[PDB]
C-alpha cells in the first residue's frame, strides 16, 4: 500500500496532494454517514507531523465554516511537505492551530478526529503523545481515526504501548492487517474503506484478503437438478474414543448440513451408536478397539473404508496417546485422498508425513495446537500470518489457524475471516467446522476454497443465533448452517 501510493504518484502521476485531499474528504463524508448532519458538532483534530496529520489538516480545513467549532492541536515537531501544505491551507482558510495540549480541552469538543499516527507509527508511543491518547480514551467523546487508530501497528494489529479506541476508522484503498487482527480490530470500531483514487489494478494487486460475502457466494457449488447423492460427494470421518464420544457426531452433521451427499463415521464401538441415536441419517461404523482408542490394529479397516469416499477428516476426539500417534501417522502416510486434519490428529502429527503425501491436506489448529505443532509458544503463533504462510508453503497444505479472526492460507494466498462471535468459544465448535471443510472438498471445492467458504459460513451461522451468543452450542450452530447458506444468496 505504501508501494501503491508511491506508484500512483511516481508512475501514474497523481500529485501527492490530490491523494491527500481525496483522503481528507473521505473522512468528512464518512463522519456524515455515521453522525448525520455535522453542523452542530464541535471538532478537535489531533495532527501529527506526518502525512496522517496532513490528512487531518485536510479534514479540519474542509469543516471550517460548516460546523460549530474546529480546533487543531498540532503534536509534532516538524511537518512533511504534504502536511505542511495542508497546514498552510488550514491557516489561510482561518483555522486555529494550537501546539499545547491541555487536559481540559476535551471539555469543549464533541468529536475527536485522531490524525496523530497512521502506517508510519514506529515503536512504542510515550510522552505527550501517550498522555494525549490516554486522555482521548477516557473522554467519552466520539472518536474518528484517520487511516488506523494511532498506536495500532498496521502490519500486525498490536498496540504499541497505548492506542486510540475509535468509534469510526476511515482507511484508504484497502483494509490494513491491523484493522483485521486483534487487538487492532477491536480498537478500529466501525471500519470504512475509502477509494482515494488509486488505479483499481493496483488495489486488486494485494495478496491478502478479507473473506467477503460476495467471495463466498461465488464459491458455493452448484446444485444441478439432475443429481444424486454421489454428485455431492462422500466423506469419511475417523474420530472419537471412549473418552470423547460427542465429537464424531458434530463433525458428521457438519458435513451433511453444508450439502454433502454421504457421510460415514468410523468410531470405536459402542461410542459409534451415539451418532445415529442423535442423527440417524449418519452412517456410524463401529470400530473394534482394544481399549477404546484407535491403534495400528485399525489401520487396514480405515484404509478400506477410505477407498469408497472422496475426502477423509481425522482427529476430533481421538485422544492423544502413543498408539493413536502411530495409527494417525501410518494412516495419513498411506491415504491417497485429500485429508482434513484436526484436533488430536494434529497433536500427534509427524509433519514429515505431510511432506511425503501426494494428496492434499487442510490442517485446522487453534493456536495451542499450532504452538505444539511447531514447538513455539502460543504468543508467538497467535495471529502470526507469516508463520502460517511459511508452514503451509513448507508442508504443501492449507492451514486454517482458528481465532476470532481466522487465517486461511496455502502459503501464496492468505484470507482473513471476520465472521463469528464468542458463542463459538465453546467445545464442539471446531468439530463442526472440520465437517464443513471436508464436506465442501467432497463437493468439488479445492482445499483452500473449501476452507474459505467454511470459516465464513461457520461464523455467520453463529451470528444468526437468536438469543444471547454465550448460550450458543454446537448443536444449535448446526441447525443454523442452512439459514446461513440461504442468506448468502
Amino acid at each position: 500500500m505504501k508501494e501503491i501510493d508511491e506508484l500512483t504518484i511516481k508512475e501514474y502521476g497523481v500529485d501527492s496532494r490530490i491523494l491527500m485531499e481525496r483522503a481528507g474528504i473521505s473522512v468528512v463524508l464518512a463522519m456524515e454517514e455515521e453522525l448525520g448532519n455535522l453542523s452542530d458538532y464541535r471538532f478537535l483534530v489531533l495532527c501529527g507531523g506526518g502525512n496522517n496529520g496532513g490528512d487531518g489538516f485536510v479534514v479540519a480545513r474542509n469543516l471550517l465554516g460548516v460546523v460549530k467549532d474546529v480546533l487543531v492541536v498540532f503534536l509534532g515537531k516538524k511537518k512533511t511537505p504534504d502536511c505542511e501544505y495542508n497546514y498552510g491551507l488550514y491557516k489561510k482558510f482561518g483555522g486555529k492551530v494550537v501546539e499545547q495540549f491541555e487536559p481540559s480541552i476535551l471539555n469543549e469538543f464533541d468529536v475527536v478526529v485522531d490524525a496523530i499516527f497512521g502506517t508510519g507509527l514506529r515503536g512504542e508511543i510515550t510522552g505527550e503523545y501517550a498522555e494525549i491518547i490516554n486522555l482521548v480514551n477516557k473522554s467519552g467523546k466520539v472518536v474518528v481515526s484517520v487511516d488506523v487508530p494511532s498506536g495500532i501497528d498496521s502490519n500486525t494489529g498490536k498496540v504499541l504501548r497505548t492506542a486510540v479506541k475509535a468509534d469510526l476508522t476511515v482507511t484508504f484503498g484497502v483494509p490494513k492487517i491491523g484493522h483485521i487482527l486483534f487487538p487492532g480490530r477491536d480498537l478500529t470500531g466501525k471500519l470504512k474503506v475509502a477509494n482515494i483514487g488509486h488505479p483499481v489494478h493496483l488495489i486488486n494487486s494485494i495478496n491478502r484478503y478479507v473473506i467477503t460475502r460476495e467471495m463466498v457466494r461465488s464459491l458455493l457449488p452448484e446444485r444441478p437438478r439432475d443429481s444424486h447423492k454421489g454428485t455431492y460427494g462422500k466423506v469419511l470421518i475417523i474420530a472419537g474414543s471412549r473418552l470423547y464420544s460427542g465429537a464424531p457426531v458434530l463433525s458428521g452433521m457438519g458435513s451433511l448440513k453444508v450439502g454433502t451427499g454421504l457421510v460415514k463415521l468410523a468410531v470405536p464401538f459402542p461410542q459409534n451408536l451415539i451418532a445415529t441415536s442423535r442423527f440417524p441419517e449418519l452412517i456410524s461404523v463401529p470400530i473394534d478397539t482394544e481399549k477404546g482408542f484407535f491403534s495400528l490394529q485399525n489401520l487396514q479397516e480405515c484404509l478400506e473404508l477410505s477407498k469408497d469416499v472422496d475426502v477423509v477428516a481425522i482427529g476430533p476426539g481421538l485422544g492423544n496417546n502413543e498408539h493413536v500417534r502411530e495409527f494417525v501417522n501410518e494412516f495419513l502416510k498411506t491415504l491417497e485422498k485429500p485429508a482434513v486434519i484436526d484436533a488430536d490428529a494434529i497433536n500427534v502429527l509427524d509433519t514429515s508425513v505431510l511432506k511425503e503425501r501426494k494428496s492434499p491436506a487442510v490442517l485446522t489448529p487453534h493456536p495451542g495446537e499450532m504452538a505444539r505443532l511447531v514447538k513455539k509458544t502460543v504468543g508467538d503463533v497467535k495471529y502470526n500470518y507469516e508463520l502460517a504462510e511459511e508452514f503451509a508453503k513448507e508442508n504443501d497444505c492449507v492451514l486454517v489457524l482458528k481465532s476470532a479472526t481466522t487465517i486461511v492460507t496455502d502459503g501464496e494466498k492468505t484470507l482473513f475471516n471476520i465472521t463469528g462471535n464468542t458463542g463459538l468459544s465453546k467445545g464442539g465448535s471446531g468439530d463442526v467446522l472440520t465437517g464443513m471443510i471436508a464436506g465442501f472438498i467432497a463437493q468439488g471445492l479445492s482445499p483452500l476454497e473449501a476452507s474459505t467458504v467454511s470459516v465464513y459460513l461457520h461464523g455467520f451461522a453463529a451470528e444468526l443465533f437468536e438469543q444471547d451468543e454465550r448460550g450458543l452450542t454446537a448443536s444449535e450452530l448446526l441447525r443454523l448452517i442452512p439459514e446461513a447458506i440461504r442468506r448468502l444468496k
Binding site: 473521505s26 463524508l29 464518512a30 454517514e33 470504512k192 474503506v193 475509502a194 477509494n195
Partner: peptide, 7 residues
C-alpha cells in the same frame, strides 16, 4: 452505491 466506500 460503493464508488467511495467499501464496508
Amino acid at each position: 452505491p460503493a464508488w467511495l466506500f467499501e464496508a
